[PDB]
Design a protein around this ligand. Structure first.
Ligand code: NAD
Ligand code: NAD
Ligand code: NAD
Ligand code: NAD
Ligand code: ZN
Ligand code: ZN
Ligand code: ZN
Ligand code: ZN
Lengths: 367, 367, 367, 367
């Protein structure tokens, strides 16, 4: 079958990039619905309003309700119609950005995406994760188009909590290993085809960037300043990981992330933190060489990502809990079946327990 | 300043991909203006009509006049309006594809691009080269958006004259060296920013793919059959070279290509064939190591690309002609000024003569 | 533009070299004004007087006032005229040597330079740093000529405080990284041209000599004895670093050194000690690979150079202080603008905080 | 004993550098005696006169008599006195430059040196080779000072006969091997001390530059154009080879060059061409590894340097002739005694015959 790569039309990144939003957006449309979470608008609404106004654009500011839900999408569509908006700008974290993408899809208008953290690879994908209003997962809304533009102000990202950059490292860490597994098995990607050389190269570049720049970038993040190492990790967490997962493929790491919703234990932990441990588990499952698992565990440990169940607050009755996680990870349609040679719940259960023991030993030897 | 990468929204490649055009295009629009050159429609119009009709799409076939000109764009716009077309599909070589992109820009509608040869990196770029009707260069039309979709049927490409695949190798050969020069000098790219890591990786992947797959792919091309080596070179000539040049940067090789319009000698040679010799000249100009120039010259020689002036039919009064080429290559606004340390016409003139002598010696030692 | 390398006419180094001063100086001139600081004359005046007298030279001893100031230069010129001196010998540390060079320039006579410590790369350069009498910086006096001869008695150097050899290592450490940055950006050097291959080779030789010989040389320095390792480090701190900085280029490390005069905190620390931390900061700024920063930090740590702000006694209100340092480091005309891609104060501020955190972590892991 | 490196005060190189002579010379002196050979003044006198006049300098043009002789030095001194010249500029090849240096020494004034070919390492040294008027060698005049400035217009050099650049490659080829031999034996250099690390690094850089750039530079030379490869070889033939031989040491290669004046056969061959074969002979004498001799022989062959006696037109009665050469090469005071372990005429004779056979075999295998 065909080989396919998808991408946002234009990806932009640099310090102060919010100040240039208006000039970047003007070739696309004149009247913008701005979905932003209240915290982000707290510090960014004035700059954003100025950027668009100076470029001659209309801006209808719509504070985000917090959840990417069908009710919230229709609420924002009503608001957008009153202002005759012809495009959507989402500014914030993953839930805000998914909502903007879905809203623009249903209005059939361009979308611009301004991540104010680099915490997941959501910004670039042709995908919105729909939840109920209460926050329970609902469905994956596959979009016919990636976002028109993605604009990352790296100074805003650097000012955010450093834990959220580490979380993005965890999400991006899975990219190479899941795309490599899909290329080994010949699996179809979310772009709908087999993998291109381009996507595999960006996926592998993602991993090497994290290895080379992750620790340097976290020093900058903890000081809330921008260095080229932080710039490179933001690119890896956003563009490389986004194109990497969507056009290179998903496999065990993300099925294992999804499987942990079968227990309540890890509720306080971010998407990318659970994906980091899912990645360690995939490496056990595919029996990666010792040096490769050690390198990944050490990278995770160096930026604060969990390498044990207890670091995700998964404690007590581990056998019952890991059976729940393993069974949900292997549910019909899950991406774990993209692993070479197929995988069942018994193998995932085994990998979960062993990956946990590996991390415990690692933490012990680190004293 | 910001770092920026641009891309077509979706790039698709595989054998028989023309048969799936209708299903690929349906999420974008329902009524398609199809710009195709008469030779391509000669063999492809029936398959293309079937693909779109089976998917429930309207197709208004508009045979292409041959030149990407303002008169031709307005002619096609009139034809499209009569059929109430809501999108444009260009199918053919570079001139057809540039026309489709420019037409869709002026109609403000999506564009799909179906290269039937892999002869240049035109398909993916947010750029149309406008000519007069007589064929004289007119202007560069910079587009606000890359094409929505690019669809390469590799069986159609493999059936085309093999010389046109080699020409695409020549255009793609420049990608790594021009992007690397721009990254060394800190030059602004056509995407409007400094280079991303992603773009440099795709540019370098482009070069390595040509080295590893070029000769294997030409065997397939000469037999008019599809192998994975030909598939990889098509990707390199189209997606990698396209994103590579636009988001990684242009430099001396393409300024030297442009400079050869100052003489009539190379009129029978394709865009990518002149770019191959421009690349050898850039390597002399930047004083690349001997092994690197030899590798490039050998790659060019192995797929039939020119490594001497005479192989471009540039013969007689070489000093006067190369002074004309060097001066036009250094004209104000040319990309040769993206080279590290700056470059003037005396240095380009020197590099032209020396690159020519290098190629002559290479051909001699090859007997 | 032209490529230019400058050098003192003759550089001499070895144990007991002061005893041979007279024979080395005789081909240059017969009547010598000897500028020496009182401490150095305390131990060296008798040997120096004997060397010159035995060779048939006149010596007018002029104890140095301590500061390289315009008033001091004119005072010494008056003294020299009374004795009809036809050349100048400076013997001591950097302030003495700069004064001798400037004095000889204004008398229009040859100058010989005898460093009695290897604490900076001042001895070889065509530059004097002029201060007011109170010690405030005044101006850079660019000289039309490097010193005629430089004579380093390595036994006198080895007898000096070991901290002053480590300081020279810190000044010399910057040489490779600043010259490499200038060669990457194409910056003009203080020799007035672009860099030669010769200057880049001496700059890189400087760095490798410090890596290979620094710790061995400090053992000798602490014992106040001469070994070949100490001999090689003296050459690196004097000739290699001198030609390296002047003909290879200055960049961020020295602008950052200059920037710390915007705060009073580091007043007790030597020129080369501040340059060592400026070098670590430049490595953060140019995002050097982790292994390279670690190697530099470990080299600094092994000879006692500072790798944190607190080791320069910069403590308390770090954000305000580092903003002052960053702004002065980026003042108009500073060498930080020789860095590839340009640099502003926000980037320098970020690099300062991150380099400080890197050094703190290094010291912590070293326990 | 002390380690000593000597250098011209300022070395300048680039295309069109003759046009900037006046501004480069003005800080040194106002009234210049210009010694130039008639051929060079034929093309350069007008530019040179303009450069000095525009900078406000006086120029007394004195066409050179052709030989560096005591009679010629006194003739030029008389001419200089009539014009009250306060400095000397030599412009031309080695004989002109040696004369300018010696003249400035006897007038006790600064000297500037403008090589118009890069054929030997004469320009930078504190040495003039004095001949009788008939052209017989007379003596080595050791100078107390290297030239104040050396200015190489690389466009003038590139315009000269290409054979003269190859000759300079031959002279420069000896630099690394003779300096390395002197460093192995601990020999005293012409700077009067043991070798510095700086001088050994420049000597080795010289050799590697010839290996990497020699063939690329000869392509440029044959086209009479300037490329960066030609620029690097000019630096290697002039600055690197000059400092390399004088401060790194001479050994067998140059003693063997000197020894060939004992026969008339090689009279039509340039200094550097005889030094190339002397270098091959030294490699036999020191029993260099096979790969090293092959590399040197191949480098020589690739730029047209002789690797056999017959290529120096030394033919007929080879045993008698090589005994004459070997005996003169080993004369008292010759530099061949700087070779490790000492050398006598029987060993040199053996090396001459064997080096000749090696070159003959090399030429044969090359067909
Ligand atoms: N569509 C995709 O491809 C994709 C991929 C991965 C994840 N997702 C979805 O993204 C959601 C999680 O995204 P998330 O991890 O970013 O959580 P999130 O969107 O809820 O935001 C995280 C928090 O960061 C806060 N914060 C503090 N300082 C901030 C600052 N400077 N900038 C922005 N926010 C700041 C925000 O207010 C927010 O509470 C999930 O619903 C996930 O399903 C989608
Ligand atoms: N916009 C950009 O970024 C960009 C980049 C490079 C070149 N260009 C422009 O592209 C133009 C040249 O493009 P080109 O080299 O492809 O020439 P072209 O578009 O004129 O087509 C080359 C020929 O291939 C013929 N042919 C034979 N078999 C074919 C087959 N199976 N499929 C398709 N064609 C077949 C075509 O009819 C055509 O005559 C130039 O105008 C150039 O300026 C634009
Ligand atoms: N012109 C240039 O290129 C250049 C380069 C770097 C620094 N500088 C200037 O050099 C000055 C600092 O030079 P410095 O760091 O050598 O300080 P310094 O010249 O003041 O001397 C340092 C101290 O070492 C003392 N001491 C103890 N034992 C000694 C011994 N055996 N020999 C010599 N001194 C001994 C000296 O008396 C002196 O107090 C600054 O003014 C700086 O601007 C100039
Ligand atoms: N002092 C030292 O350290 C040292 C080192 C090596 C050689 N030497 C001496 O240098 C002398 C040989 O020097 P040489 O080989 O350069 O020969 P040379 O000085 O006689 O000049 C070579 C010829 O090049 C001609 N020519 C043609 N085009 C020219 C152009 N553009 N520019 C300059 N010249 C051009 C010149 O007129 C000249 O006839 C010998 O006397 C040698 O002893 C001295
Ligand atoms: Zn994820
Ligand atoms: Zn092209
Ligand atoms: Zn310094
Ligand atoms: Zn020589």
């Amino acid at each position: 079958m065909d080989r396919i790569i998808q991408s946002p039309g234009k990806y932009i990144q640099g310090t102060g990039a919010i100040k240039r939003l208006g000039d970047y957006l003007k070739p696309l449309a004149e009247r913008w619905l701005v979905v932003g979470d209240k915290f982000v608008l707290g510090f960014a609404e004035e700059m954003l309003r100025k950027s668009l106004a100076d470029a001659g654009l209309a801006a209808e500011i719509a504070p985000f309700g917090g959840e990417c839900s069908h009710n919230e999408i229709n609420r924002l569509r009503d608001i957008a119609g009153n202002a005759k908006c012809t495009a959507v700008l989402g500014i914030g974290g993953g839930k805000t950005l998914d909502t903007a993408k879905a809203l623009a899809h249903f209005m059939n208008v361009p979308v611009a995406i301004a991540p104010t953290i680099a915490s997941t690879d959501a910004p670039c994908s042709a995908l919105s994760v729909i939840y109920t209003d209460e926050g329970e997962f609902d469905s994956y809304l596959m979009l016919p188009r990636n976002p028109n533009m993605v604009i990352v102000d790296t100074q805003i990202v650097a000012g955010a909590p450093a834990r959220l950059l580490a979380a993005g490292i965890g999400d991006a860490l899975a990219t190479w290993f899941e795309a490599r597994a899909c290329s080994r098995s010949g699996a179809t990607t979310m772009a709908g085809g087999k993998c291109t050389q381009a996507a595999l190269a960006l996926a592998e570049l993602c991993y090497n960037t994290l290895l080379e720049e992750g620790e340097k970038a976290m020093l900058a993040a903890e000081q809330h300043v921008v260095t080229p190492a932080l710039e490179r990790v933001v690119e890896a967490n956003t563009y490389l990981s986004g194109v990497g997962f969507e056009s290179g493929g998903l496999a065990a790491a993300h099925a294992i992330h999804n499987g942990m919703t079968a227990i309540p234990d890890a509720h306080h932990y971010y998407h990318g933190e659970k994906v980091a441990f899912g990645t360690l588990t995939q490496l056990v499952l595919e029996n990666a060489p010792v040096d490769e698992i050690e390198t990944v565990a050490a990278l995770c440990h160096s930026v604060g990502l969990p390498i044990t169940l207890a670091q995700l607050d998964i404690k007590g009755d581990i056998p019952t809990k890991m059976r729940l996680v393993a069974e949900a990870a292997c549910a019909e349609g899950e991406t774990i079946h993209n692993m070479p040679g197929g995988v069942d719940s018994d193998q995932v259960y085994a990998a979960l327990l062993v990956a946990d023991q590996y991390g415990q030993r690692f933490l012990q030897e680190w004293e």
